[PDB]
Design a protein around this ligand. Structure first.
Ligand SMILES: O=C(O)CCCC[C@@H]1SC[C@@H]2NC(=O)N[C@@H]21
Ligand SMILES: O=C(O)CCCC[C@@H]1SC[C@@H]2NC(=O)N[C@@H]21
Ligand SMILES: O=C(O)CCCC[C@@H]1SC[C@@H]2NC(=O)N[C@@H]21
Ligand SMILES: O=C(O)CCCC[C@@H]1SC[C@@H]2NC(=O)N[C@@H]21
Ligand SMILES: [Mg+2]
Ligand SMILES: [Mg+2]
Ligand SMILES: [Mg+2]
Ligand SMILES: [Mg+2]
Ligand SMILES: [Mg+2]
Ligand SMILES: [Mg+2]
Lengths: 123, 123, 123, 123
């Protein structure tokens, strides 16, 4: 099956955040992201891109972006990583969360972390 | 002016890569990215998101993704950072470049770097 | 706190790498690191620094460096993160692995990842 | 190579931070780091490691760590990158700044950035 058949759907990370992901035939990603951490309370939309043609036995490289804006927050996260559809499906990512700052404070504006997404919510 | 008025257009980074960026009213980013490094030879499409409503005197947080696939490459980069439209416009970013690997080799699959984009190509 | 009483010792990460860590009273880290991945085959020494006085209910921030040199490898990794002693001890880190390159190739010189260290080797 | 003959000394980054670096024959780095940003006001000691034998035309990979502790700060930074001595000397780095947090807040504990060090203070 094509990548979208395995990639489109709901994914959950270790923080119990929920991503409703759609992988389109043109290689784009769309959908909604609900973070269980940070001062956000509803899903925010995502946009990204993903590999259509992974070499056999290798991951689908992919990445996506979310802009977060509410009364208190003006930031954007990107996730970059690989989706593996075989055996135990997973999206293994690292992410960069850049927050709006004064130009002089750019040095302290970007958080880095890692998220692992699976098809079942963590207990 | 709204963010798109200042953000849409051609941007160049320190590597002399050229990004043709369009900032849409719905907060999405689209366009094309031509890297001057790596074994890629034509532009690749991008998708991302950006802040619509930056607090006064602060950056527009934003991020975008490119999937790179050709005969030799299966990878994806995301950039995360801030766009400043005042005085000397700049997009200051950090990026994560994830390459397709076997699942056991995920540890060595993600490069990290930084790109600074301006409105004029470097000499 | 007496951080060294909990921090000094052998630690194992998810890749089954083994770190023999000593935390000194002056806030320095020394020891040996044996990676189970990459083209390295013997332990390499480490040097780092760690917080001596963690706030109650919070992690000990710490970081260390390893220089790797053999016939084919010239690189260095740093790990940055937090050590939690109070329950299920762990060192949660992100790391940066910089490899020797030509100056023009710096953009592709740094890998990023994450390692979780515990007191028992993974099965 | 005799790396220490070029590496030991005072270095300045883009933020006008000043690092007094000593590179020892055993491959260790020691010295003092004075940051011009963040709520720190005195130098803090560093510990690290560096490549002793760079391949011709390539950088010396290196990394170091600083633990920062004062009345309000408990954090640690590591820098990872490359030192180039042969022309216009520079240390090109990326860094990870981990701050003490509750275990549940680890996701927001690590900043990432980049520092370029040269032998002359920025204007
Ligand atoms: O606090 C913000 O600026 C907005 C919410 C950010 C939540 C981040 S995104 C990376 C990490 N993974 C998640 O599922 N949530 C956090
Ligand atoms: O080599 C690849 O896997 C595809 C090309 C990657 C080029 C990267 S993306 C980050 C950095 N910034 C650029 O303008 N080019 C490189
Ligand atoms: O390949 C090299 O350049 C030297 C070995 C690097 C091994 C890395 S360090 C980060 C990660 N964690 C480990 O325990 N091993 C790898
Ligand atoms: O705020 C802290 O937690 C301690 C000071 C951190 C200063 C950082 S380290 C990375 C960057 N480079 C510098 O020269 N200063 C900042
Ligand atoms: Mg909200
Ligand atoms: Mg091509
Ligand atoms: Mg070896
Ligand atoms: Mg895990
Ligand atoms: Mg101080
Ligand atoms: Mg610069």
């Amino acid at each position: 099956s094509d990548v979208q058949s395995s990639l489109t759907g709901t994914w959950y990370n270790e923080l119990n955040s929920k991503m409703e992901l759609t992988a389109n035939k043109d290689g784009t990603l769309t959908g909604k992201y609900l973070s269980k951490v940070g001062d956000v309370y509803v899903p925010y939309p995502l946009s990204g891109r993903y590999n259509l043609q992974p070499p056999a036995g290798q991951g689908v490289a992919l990445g996506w972006a979310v802009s977060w804006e509410n009364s208190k927050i003006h930031s954007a996260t990107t996730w970059s990583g690989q989706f593996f559809s075989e055996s135990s499906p997973v999206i293994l990512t690292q992410w960069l969360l850049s927050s709006s700052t004064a130009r002089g404070d750019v040095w302290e504006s970007t958080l880095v972390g890692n998220d692992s997404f699976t098809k079942t919510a963590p207990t």
